[PDB]
Symmetry: D2
């Protein structure tokens, strides 16, 4: 998997389960074409988002539906979602893991490229 997402819950101290993750790729009209999506499993990861062949260089947006996640838990959140926008770059073998640590009024996100 060239691209993985992992979502953690900073309130419960556990992975964020059943979170909706939508990925988009920037089109020539500068519009966001749906690219991949999924919902996080018990490990806080969605399964098999894309393939080496599809994940070409390009500007991608990963949108984590945090607001539904907090609502389910009964905690009013601040954000509509968490959005991570980045250019995928070819430069040797490289797997992308986008991690997001969620709290109701904040989130942090990092990319681990390996």
């Amino acid at each position: 998997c060239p691209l993985m997402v992992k979502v953690l819950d900073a309130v419960r101290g556990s992975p964020a389960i059943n979170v909706a993750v939508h990925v988009f790729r920037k089109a020539a009209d500068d519009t966001w074409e749906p690219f991949a999506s999924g919902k996080t499993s018990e490990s806080g990861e969605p399964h098999g988002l894309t393939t080496e062949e599809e994940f070409v260089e390009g500007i991608y947006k990963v949108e984590i539906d945090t607001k539904s996640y907090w609502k389910a838990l009964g905690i009013s959140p601040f954000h509509e979602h968490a959005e991570v926008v980045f250019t995928a770059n070819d430069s040797g073998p490289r797997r992308y893991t986008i991690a997001a640590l969620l709290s109701p009024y904040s989130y942090s996100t990092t990319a681990v490229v390996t």
Copy 2:
């Protein structure tokens, strides 16, 4: 000022200065409409982004141009920008401070909302 943004550089341990900040508000036809924009000063915040009258209920997006920032410092960053999208003033006016802490390959953002 009902909407303030503060941007911090976690590499340099300082406010992130000269950072472009663009704010959009979701239009009726569901597109993002320009709402406000500024650039952070030495304190890491843009000034006078909006007014209480203009900052009505809506869904807003604060886009902080982190890529141009890291690039001016000579770093090649991961993200194109940091993006903060939220519903504002849903229970009446609040004052919102969106803070973002920036690293080349990560950022964290939190909001302090006061009545």
Copy 3:
């Protein structure tokens, strides 16, 4: 004030108020000696922690009592406190703002250091 601390609650989206802050400075015999202490006000910061004269070179530890905070809000937190240990004033006096963003099972801390 050459040493300031700001504490934010990432659950409530507000400053963390009534939080105890203890500062220690590493003694010659290598133990941690009490240096300063306060409690955050409504802005999430304690006030007048130290003075330029007192805040000499050394290794400091800022311990923010996050556990008692989360417990007063009725949450059972992971950490006993958040701990920020750093060398201060090594290249001459600086002003230091230690910020900490708190969640029940995580926290992040950054320092803004100005000349």
Copy 4:
């Protein structure tokens, strides 16, 4: 492994390799007894810190030697180290992963209990 540590580098966008991780357990004199240690591997994790039998309830401190890590990279850091102090609590099956995301002037840390 009842207790795992994972260290990420927010500047390089990769795990933090060769980082020194010391774990301590609070003694009755309120002093910190060395408990476990190791250095992070290519995955940013030290290997086999402790065992189910040793990791009893108690107050633990995990100290990540961030300052040596940044020095090696040639980046002046702020912190002497990152220190994560917590009470291990028995309450059903539970593995602790202490994650830390490091930048020169900041770090965040979260516990994933699963």
